Scaffold this active site. Structure first.
Site, PDB file in Angstrom:
ATOM      1  CG  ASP A 159      -1.605   1.279  -3.749  1.00 24.99           C
ATOM      2  OD1 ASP A 159      -1.841   1.641  -2.580  1.00 24.99           O
ATOM      3  OD2 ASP A 159      -1.251   0.123  -4.073  1.00 24.99           O
ATOM      4  CG  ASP A 195       5.996  -0.411  -2.630  1.00 18.97           C
ATOM      5  OD1 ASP A 195       6.816  -1.249  -2.191  1.00 18.97           O
ATOM      6  OD2 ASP A 195       4.817  -0.273  -2.239  1.00 18.97           O
ATOM      7  CB  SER A 231       4.947  -0.773   0.469  1.00 25.01           C
ATOM      8  OG  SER A 231       4.018  -1.666   0.951  1.00 25.01           O
ATOM      9  N   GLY A 279      -1.722  -1.604   6.098  1.00 24.64           N
ATOM     10  CA  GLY A 279      -1.456  -2.619   7.119  1.00 24.64           C
ATOM     11  C   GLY A 279      -2.400  -3.741   6.854  1.00 24.64           C
ATOM     12  CB  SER A 285       2.049   0.413  -3.829  1.00 23.97           C
ATOM     13  OG  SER A 285       2.390   0.370  -2.449  1.00 23.97           O
ATOM     14  NE  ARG A 309       0.740  -4.163  -7.408  1.00 24.77           N
ATOM     15  CZ  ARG A 309       1.982  -4.231  -7.909  1.00 24.77           C
ATOM     16  NH1 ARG A 309       2.989  -4.784  -7.240  1.00 24.77           N
ATOM     17  NH2 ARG A 309       2.229  -3.745  -9.109  1.00 24.77           N
ATOM     18  CB  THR A 313      -0.958   0.039   1.244  1.00 28.35           C
ATOM     19  OG1 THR A 313      -1.903  -1.052   1.216  1.00 28.35           O
ATOM     20  CG2 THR A 313      -1.746   1.322   1.325  1.00 28.35           C
ATOM     21  CE  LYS A 333      -4.330  -0.701  -1.359  1.00 30.04           C
ATOM     22  NZ  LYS A 333      -2.880  -0.969  -1.589  1.00 30.04           N
TER      23      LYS A 333
END
EC number: 3.4.25.1
Lengths: 241, 242, 197, 222, 243, 237, 249, 204
Positions: free
Chosen positions: D17, D166, D129, D47, D169, D19, D1, D33
């Site tokens: 994001d 990352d 992340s 998390g 994400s 993913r 995330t 999210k």
């Protein structure tokens, strides 16, 4: 939460609630039990009113606690169910920790003990029921019969009755039950049981139920044709002047 | 002195009866009448709703007939609200049984449970008893089609035909006369309606004042029908009450 | 210890080892690892020491209670549903009962024999034949081969004996043989003569 | 995330994001999210997903009930306070790192909430992340007093930073904009830079390809 | 006797006598209070009576500072009034902690009123024989007066008065507001609003007041405080200009 | 007990007062930098060991309490009071302020007028001491009512005392020395005895002065006590 | 601690639950309130009787929102009503939103309230609620509903009804004015007319409180971006909105 | 070792034009040991379908739980429960045991009786919802199921093809998992009707 003292002593030494519980029993359908030589029988009046009952399912007055013991009663039906359930559990539990079924007295002592408990506890009223526990101790052939009251008192009887007009059928059993020669057969004991009901039942055959307990968990409920056959026998005797 | 207000709801009268129970039954004698009739291939519930007004939405008001589960229903006489509390407990006891044993609950097991719950308010807690009398209609695979009744006393019994609420003496008498054991569902429908019609404290028995349900026989499985207000009206015609 | 079970045409056969080993000594060569729950429903069991019987007896008692209350015999299906349901509670319990059971029964209504295997996690599954522990590993290969759903009780007892020979030959523990019981429309009885067949 | 929150002159904006992963696998290539606590208080979580949703819906259930009782619009500090006090009581066992933002009668707000119970305040923030990639961009381009558009571009660039570099994400950019006067505008998939290219061939099967042992109708009726 | 007179249960008329009786207990201190609102402040005036010479007059008060922002005046016996102030303060403190901001005057009134309602339904608890008039300068609603009673009732007031002569004072203000044609004393300084209250009380009650016959609480944004026998008198000397 | 009479009053509380009134008389005097408490102890017989039946109680180290009416209730309240003052100290470090303390008792006593399964206290309680900002004298009734005092009294001879007490307030507007108040409080106990005259009595005085006792609460004994007896004893004639 | 662990509401020889009857009598004395159901919406209303010309009527809401599509109103003891809305609002979350992720349907919430009201009859140491509620609401699968709830916990669904002071008169009025083809606008109009007879004092947008359950209002949602959320169906009218319909009347 | 690896198996769902499909394997292991080739992991409640992979005793319990809950729902709501509502119910239910969860991978699949919409969803053992519109995978061969569905899936499939796509996606994933297989089943769901088919496959 709620613990008010419902069962308490009145100035002359009586516990009114317990007495009024017996009054409920007085208005119960006559229950009766007599002991034979190698058997015990339990008879039970059933109100003659509705020809509209479903007799397959309507709760029957005689109940099994275990395979070798039954319990008959008089008084408040709903209270009886609660005594039966508690009894059948104590039965299954006694086997589980003693590896042997209950003696008829033990079971009785237990039930009477519960009754007593409702006379001496807070927030509860006693049981409006009085009972007839009968059966055979395991591997024993000597028959047993007990009675318990709402007070929690109990004792063994050669023959006994409880409920409405019980006063009258004990009168009949006191004069008609020879201690020294107890109804030898199963047939004599059942006949003797029915006769005592025909003083009180009014239109006998139709509204009577007899259950026969013999040793080694041998219990059977009589189908009215078989019971009725005993009622025609009663005419014969009486019909000879 | 908090004990001066305790109505002692769980004591015996000198005669050996539970005031509160008798008095609960008294108020039940004023509830709209409910009938139960059992045939060899179905069961019938019928009830006069005593809350009556033209603006009342009949199409919605589930006031007397309720469903505990797929094969068991009840008819109520008394405080609707009280019955609802008891109904939800029963609905669950059915579901707990189902979950434990993977067989639907046999009809008596559920009646006995709900009748003990009532019998308890009768013997402890010092709370007024539930002011409800129930008529149970159900079908299981042990005793087939069955009919029962229970009241605030916690006492229950089984029947072929039975009534609760107002005018039960009257209703019960008419049921003895015309009930025959071989009956067929359709007869029970006509008998229940005829019966209510002659016991109603109203000028006439109209659909707007009824709730009607049946338990019947795909195949080898049981259908439970609640009649909508249109269905009751139609059924009222054929029978010859309209 | 060995728990086996096989369902044939008109019955269910249960085999259960007679040895009880505590430490390096075989305390007993005669233990009957079973309990009759009801007149037409029998239950073998294997697992952790006390738990094994404490569980078996608890169930039995409970079923005997249900029997009396309703004056009726629960179907073998309902009993196993109840049994799983208990073992299922055990798994998230403070201390779990580590018992594996087999429930062989004769459904008097439907007239067919039924065999249920349930492990201590409450994993019930219904089978033609079953076992717990490693008993499956040596026997299943043979049961897969010979088993016929139309078998007679005699045919069953033979396929069972064969499974017992395999265990006897290739399993490093001496379990002192099995006690065989049969559940059928007439109740449960014991084959007191399996030492030779 | 990769999640962020960026304050602008007349309000606040948050982004994320889409993913959702289980280990190295991508369970969902487009989940949201961005969570609503109250119409004008939104919250972005990282998390343990179940935790960020459960702790969001729960506080939002109460915040509603509170707003009703008090007859006043819910404030970002109430949602902050109730969140941290809950998270704290649970000693970090509720895996929810959040960025709570929104407008209420007292103005606009932006906060961070860690699983253990600590909260921080600021004008630009990031969690997940991409927490470092995004923050690299935020430190590079955030200035004080920025327009709604400047802020949205910035918050959106910080999430791309995340998406690309990352592996925790990826996929898309969601954005929620909370301006002091206006209604909150949740722009789901405000950016979709990652579209799967047309496959090299249709994999559809000639009917009957699959062996069937037995057939059945299933009964839903009563 | 009737049981329905002693516990919180319905009479056949559909009334709770206990609730009604608790309303009587509120006049037991024979003290009147009044509250009014400024352009950006809120004032409460209470009668102060210290007949006994043995009483430290500094410790005789029915005005309480609940929160830093909320103020409460009570008409009724001190033991129950204190029982309430404590609660309210506790509630005020807690609401802060939990929700992140200062408990608003109206919310506290709703809360305290919910609790009063409970004693009205539950037979083990009696109602409190008091009437709480809360005041503040709310950050959302501005200067505010919400008053709760033993029945569980509360509403918001433009201004209000409570006590034995509640009525005289009330009609005095209703009258003032007809001409005013507004919901507040149009005054920029709280000092002039306090003066006004005191004037209309003197008028309504037809009595002159010394610095020691009054008790004055004042709410301004961010602070609720009370005036001393001096702060009061300075205010009292000013009323001697026009009248 | 939590019942409101139609008037708005609570009869149980009013009765509890009756029990207070027919008790012995106790009083308290606020001085320049402290407080003094005195109480009337009736000697029913030569059998009671003199000056060894103490009725005045100490809370924490700095608060003195005295009560007229049902004695055991009064202890129950001091016990409660001691707990209260300890929790406070445990959390807030500082020893409990007098007003703080007055309210702790205030709230607890009031709580007994809220329910009808509970009986209100059968005492009026005179108490106080020195806190970081002065001396304080308080009196608390069975209803939970309490206020600060200049002087206070309660019991059989309350009007006798209060009359004399108002006079001190008037003839000493400037203050009152702690030693003056000790003596003075003995006089007021003797005059309150004219009412309860039928029996012989014993006197018990405690004080709490910043100068004379350090803020600590202590009993007036031996030497200083005998002169207080004297001041009054011979002034009575 | 409590001591009344026993029922304060008990059967009398006649079969009456005394205290419920008395609670009903409290509702008789309540200010007239009513509800009317239309083909495309429900409306509820009542008279804002004020206990002082110095009280600000706006602060007291007799018409309250339980859920975005459900609203309530009452006649009887206000405080009992107030605490019922708090409890009702919460249950709508605890027993439903928090487990199905959606508001409960109208009939189910009405049950949760009857349930609360029932328990005050039977339970230890309490009197029944002194109110009758009218609950108006819309859910996806049943459409617009109108429910009434008495102190006993009994609830009946209505096409239209009135409770409180002028109830027999109003239901009389409503019983001849209602039909299955009403449009919200018409029912709003009728509700205002029924309420005219029930008020002696001023009759305007400030002395009246009236709300509806009808179309969905996006302007009342608070946010955008989510196409499957269109706003609440509960919409309270302003003084203004009412008066526009009073000139017309 | 892993409670989601003792018994094994998989479940997968998909959406096509006006229909939805849900499939599972029939294995029940005890680690390496094959125990049942008749373990159906797909159940229904009214017109809502639920697949449950993982720990068998939890799978069984959850069926028994959701059956119960949905009945009490029907009795009260007077209607059958819709996929969207059920999905939420499953998530509440799982998160209820947040710190002692049932070790499972639930999959919801069904068509909204009212809106006529195909709907499906996935969850973690603690309730986290995935409402993807294309496909959902779950269990011991979730890695392979993603592999298949990603390459083989295409929107708007007609039921008769949707059947071929899902069937091949199950079969080939299971055949690359030691703990999945031993037979398989595929449900094809439409507003009018539901069709259930058993597949032929390797039994090793």
């Amino acid at each position: 939460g709620y613990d008010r003292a419902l069962s308490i002593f009145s100035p002359d030494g009586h516990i009114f609630q317990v007495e009024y519980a017996l009054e409920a029993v007085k208005r119960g359908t006559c229950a009766v039990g007599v002991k034979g030589k190698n058997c015990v029988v339990l008879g039970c009046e059933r109100r003659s009113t509705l020809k509209l009952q479903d007799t397959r399912i309507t709760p029957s007055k005689v109940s099994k606690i275990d395979s070798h013991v039954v319990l008959s009663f008089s008084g408040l039906n709903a209270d009886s169910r609660i005594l039966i359930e508690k009894a059948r559990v104590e039965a299954q539990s006694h086997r589980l920790t003693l590896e042997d079924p209950v003696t008829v007295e033990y079971l009785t002592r237990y039930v009477a003990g519960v009754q007593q408990r409702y006379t001496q506890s807070g927030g509860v009223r006693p049981f409006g029921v009085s009972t007839l526990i009968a059966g055979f101790d395991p591997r024993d052939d000597e028959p047993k019969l007990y009675q318990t009251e709402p007070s929690g008192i109990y004792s063994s009887w050669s023959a006994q009755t409880i409920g409405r007009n019980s006063k009258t059928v004990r009168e009949f059993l006191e004069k008609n039950y020879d201690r020294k020669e107890p109804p030898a057969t199963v047939e004599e004991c059942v006949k003797l049981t029915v006769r005592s009901l025909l003083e009180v039942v009014q239109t006998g055959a139709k509204n009577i139920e007899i259950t026969v307990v013999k040793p080694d968990s041998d219990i059977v409920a009589l189908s009215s044709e078989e019971i009725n056959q005993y009622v025609t026998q009663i005419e014969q005797e009486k019909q000879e002047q | 002195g908090s004990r001066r207000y305790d109505s002692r709801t769980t004591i015996f009268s000198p005669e050996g009866r539970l005031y509160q129970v008798e008095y609960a039954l008294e108020s039940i004698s004023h509830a709209g009448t409910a009938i139960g009739i059992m045939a060899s291939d179905g069961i019938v519930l019928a009830a006069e709703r005593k809350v009556t007004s033209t603006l009342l939405e009949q199409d919605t008001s589930t006031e007397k007939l309720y469903k505990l589960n797929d094969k068991i229903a009840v008819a109520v006489a008394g405080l609707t609200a009280d019955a609802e509390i008891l109904i939800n407990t029963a609905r669950i006891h059915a579901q707990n049984y189902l979950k434990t044993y993977n067989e639907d609950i046999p009809v008596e097991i559920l009646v006995r449970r709900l009748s003990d719950i009532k019998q308890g308010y009768t013997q402890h807690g010092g709370l007024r008893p539930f002011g409800v009398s129930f008529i149970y209609a159900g079908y299981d695979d042990r005793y087939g089609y069955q009919l029962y009744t229970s009241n605030p006393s916690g006492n229950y019994t089984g029947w072929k035909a039975i009534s609760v609420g107002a005018n039960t003496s009257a209703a019960q008498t008419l049921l003895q006369m015309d009930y025959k054991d071989d009956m067929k569902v359709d007869d029970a429908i006509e008998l229940a309606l005829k019966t209510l019609s002659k016991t109603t404290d109203s000028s006439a028995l109209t659909y707007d004042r009824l709730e009607f349900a049946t338990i019947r026989k795909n195949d080898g499985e049981v259908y439970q029908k609640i009649f909508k207000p249109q269905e009751i009206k139609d059924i009222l015609v054929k029978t010859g009450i309209t | 210890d060995i728990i086996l079970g096989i369902r044939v045409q008109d019955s269910v056969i249960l085999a259960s080892s007679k040895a009880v080993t505590r430490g390096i000594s075989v305390l007993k060569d005669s233990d009957d690892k079973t309990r009759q729950l009801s007149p037409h429903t029998l239950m073998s069991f294997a697992g952790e020491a006390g738990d094994t019987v404490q569980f078996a007896e608890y169930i039995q008692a409970n079923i005997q209670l249900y029997s009396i209350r309703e004056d009726y015999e629960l179907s073998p299906q309902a009993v196993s549903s109840f049994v799983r349901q208990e073992l299922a509670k055990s798994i998230r319990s403070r201390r779990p009962y580590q018992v594996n059971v087999l429930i062989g029964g004769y459904d008097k209504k439907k007239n067919k024999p039924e065999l249920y295997q349930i492990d201590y996690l409450g994993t019930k599954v219904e089978l033609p034949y079953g076992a717990h522990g490693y008993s499956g590993f040596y026997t299943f290969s043979l049961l897969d081969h010979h088993y016929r759903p139309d078998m007679t009780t005699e045919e069953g007892l033979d396929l069972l004996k064969l499974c017992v020979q395999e265990l006897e030959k290739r399993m490093p523990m001496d379990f002192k043989g099995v006690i065989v019981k049969i559940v059928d429309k007439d109740g449960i009885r014991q084959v007191d003569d399996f030492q030779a067949q | 995330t990769t999640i962020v929150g960026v304050k602008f002159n007349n309000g606040v904006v948050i982004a994320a994001d889409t993913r959702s992963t289980q280990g190295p696998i991508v369970a969902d290539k487009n989940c949201a999210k961005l969570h609503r606590i109250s119409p004008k208080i939104w919250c972005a979580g990282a998390g343990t997903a179940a935790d960020t949703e459960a702790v969001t819906q729960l506080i939002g259930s109460n915040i509603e009930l509170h707003s009703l009782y008090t007859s006043r619009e819910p404030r970002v500090v109430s949602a902050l306070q109730m969140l941290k006090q809950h998270l704290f009581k649970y000693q970090g066992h509720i895996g929810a790192y959040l960025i709570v933002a929104g407008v209420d009668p007292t103005g606009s707000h932006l906060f961070s909430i860690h699983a253990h119970g600590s909260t921080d305040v600021g004008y630009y923030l990031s969690l997940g992340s991409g927490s470092l990639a995004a923050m690299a961009v935020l430190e590079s381009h955030w200035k004080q007093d920025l327009t709604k558009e400047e802020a949205i571009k910035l918050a959106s660039d910080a999430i791309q930073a995340g998406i690309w570099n990352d592996l925790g994400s990826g996929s898309n950019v969601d954005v929620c904009v909370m301006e002091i006067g206006k209604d909150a505008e949740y722009l789901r998939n405000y950016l979709t830079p990652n579209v799967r290219e047309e496959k090299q061939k249709s994999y559809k099967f000639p009917r009957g390809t699959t062996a069937v042992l037995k057939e059945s109708i299933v009964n839903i009726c009563d | 006797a009737g049981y329905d007179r002693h516990i919180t249960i319905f009479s056949p008329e559909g009334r709770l006598y206990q609730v009604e009786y608790a309303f009587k207990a509120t006049n037991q201190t024979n003290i009147n209070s009044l509250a009014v609102r400024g352009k950006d402040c809120t004032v409460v005036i209470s009668q102060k009576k210290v007949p006994d010479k043995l009483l430290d007059p500094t410790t005789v008060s029915y005005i309480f500072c609940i929160s830093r922002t909320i103020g409460m005046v009570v008409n009724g016996p001190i033991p129950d009034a204190r029982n309430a102030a404590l609660r309210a303060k506790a509630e005020a403190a807690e609401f802060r902690y939990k929700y992140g901001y200062d408990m608003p005057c109206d919310v506290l009134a709703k809360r305290m009123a919910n609790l009063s309602q409970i004693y009205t339904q539950r037979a083990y608890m009696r109602p409190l024989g008091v009437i709480l008039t809360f005041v503040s300068v709310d950050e959302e609603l501005g200067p505010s007066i919400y008053k709760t009673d033993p029945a569980g009732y509360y509403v918001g007031y433009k201004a209000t008065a409570t006590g034995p002569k509640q009525q005289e004072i009330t009609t005095n203000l209703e009258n003032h507001f007809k001409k005013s044609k507004i919901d507040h004393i149009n005054e920029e300084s709280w000092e002039k609003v306090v003066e006004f209250a005191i004037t209309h009380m003197i008028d309504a009650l037809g009595t002159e007041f010394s610095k020691n016959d009054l008790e004055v609480g004042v709410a301004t944004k961010d602070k609720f405080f009370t005036l001393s026998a001096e702060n009061i008198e300075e205010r009292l000397v000013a009323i001697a200009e026009q009248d | 007990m939590s019942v409101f009479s139609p008037d708005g009053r609570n009869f149980q509380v009013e009765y509890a007062v009756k029990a207070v009134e027919n008790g012995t008389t106790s009083i308290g005097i606020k001085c320049n930098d402290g407080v003094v408490f005195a109480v009337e102890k009736l000697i029913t017989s030569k059998l009671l060991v003199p000056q060894k039946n103490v009725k005045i109680q100490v809370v924490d180290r700095h608060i003195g309490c005295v009560y007229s009416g049902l004695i055991p209730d009064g202890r129950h309240l001091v016990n409660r009071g001691r707990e209260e003052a300890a929790s406070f100290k445990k959390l807030y470090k500082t020893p409990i302020p007098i007003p703080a303390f007055a309210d702790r008792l205030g709230q607890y006593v009031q709580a007994h007028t809220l329910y009808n399964s509970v009986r209100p206290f059968g005492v009026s309680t005179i108490f106080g001491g020195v806190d970081k900002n002065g001396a304080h004298l308080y009196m608390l009734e069975p209803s939970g009512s309490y206020w600060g005092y200049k002087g206070a009294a309660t019991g059989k001879g309350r009007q006798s005392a209060k009359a004399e007490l108002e006079k001190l307030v008037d003839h000493h507007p400037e203050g009152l020395s702690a030693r003056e108040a000790v003596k003075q409080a003995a006089k007021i106990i003797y005059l309150a005895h004219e009412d309860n005259k039928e029996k012989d009595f014993e006197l018990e005085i405690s004080w709490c002065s910043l100068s004379e006792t350090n803020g600590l609460h202590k009993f007036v004994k031996g030497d200083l006590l005998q002169e207080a007896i004297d001041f009054a004893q011979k002034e009575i004639n | 601690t409590d001591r009344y662990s026993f029922s304060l509401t008990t059967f009398s020889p006649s079969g009456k639950l005394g205290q419920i009857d008395y609670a009903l009598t409290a509702v008789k004395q309540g200010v007239t309130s009513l509800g009317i159901k239309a083909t495309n919406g429900v409306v509820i209303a009542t008279e804002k009787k004020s206990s002082s010309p110095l009280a600000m009527s706006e602060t007291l809401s007799k018409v309250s929102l339980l859920t975005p599509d459900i609203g309530a109103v009452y006649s009887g003891m206000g405080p009992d009503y107030r605490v019922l809305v708090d409890k009702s609002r919460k249950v709508a979350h605890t027993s439903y939103k928090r487990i199905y992720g959606e508001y409960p349907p109208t009939k189910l919430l009405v049950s949760e309230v009857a349930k609360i009201m029932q328990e005050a009859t039977q339970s230890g140491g309490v009197r029944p609620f002194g109110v009758s509620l009218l609950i108006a609401g819309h859910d996806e699968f049943n459409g617009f509903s109108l429910y009434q709830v008495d102190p006993s916990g009994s609830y009946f669904p209505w096409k239209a009804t009135a409770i409180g002071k002028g109830s027999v008169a109003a239901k009389t009025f409503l019983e001849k004015r209602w039909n299955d083809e009403l449009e919200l606008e018409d029912a709003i109009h009728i509700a205002l007319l029924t309420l005219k007879e029930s008020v002696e004092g001023e009759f305007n947008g400030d002395t009246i409180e009236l709300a509806i359950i009808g179309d969905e209002n996006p302007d009342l949602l608070g946010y955008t971006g989510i196409p499957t959320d269109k706003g609440p169906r509960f919409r309270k009218l302003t003084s203004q909105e009412i008066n526009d319909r009073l000139e017309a009347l | 070792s892993d409670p989601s690896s003792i018994n094994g198996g998989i479940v997968v769902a998909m959406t096509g034009k006006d229909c939805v499909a849900i499939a599972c394997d029939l294995r029940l292991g005890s680690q390496s040991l094959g125990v049942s080739n008749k373990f159906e992991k797909i159940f229904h409640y009214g017109h809502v379908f639920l697949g449950i992979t993982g720990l068998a005793t939890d799978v069984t319990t959850l069926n028994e739980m959701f059956r119960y809950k949905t009945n009490l729902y029907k009795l009260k709501e007077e209607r059958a429960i819709e996929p969207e509502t059920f999905t939420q119910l499953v998530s509440s239910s799982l998160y209820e045991r947040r710190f002692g969860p049932y070790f499972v991978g639930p999959v919801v699949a069904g068509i909204n009786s009212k809106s006529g919409k195909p709907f499906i969803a996935g969850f973690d053992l603690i309730g986290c919802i995935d409402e993807a519109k294309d496909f959902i995978v779950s269990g011991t061969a979730s890695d392979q199921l993603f592999g298949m569905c990603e390459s083989l899936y295409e929107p708007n499939l007609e039921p008769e093809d949707l059947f071929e796509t899902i069937s091949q996606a199950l079969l080939n994933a299971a055949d690359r998992d030691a703990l999945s297989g031993w037979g398989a089943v595929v449900y094809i769901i439409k507003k009018d009707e539901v069709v259930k088919r058993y597949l032929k496959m390797r039994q090793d």
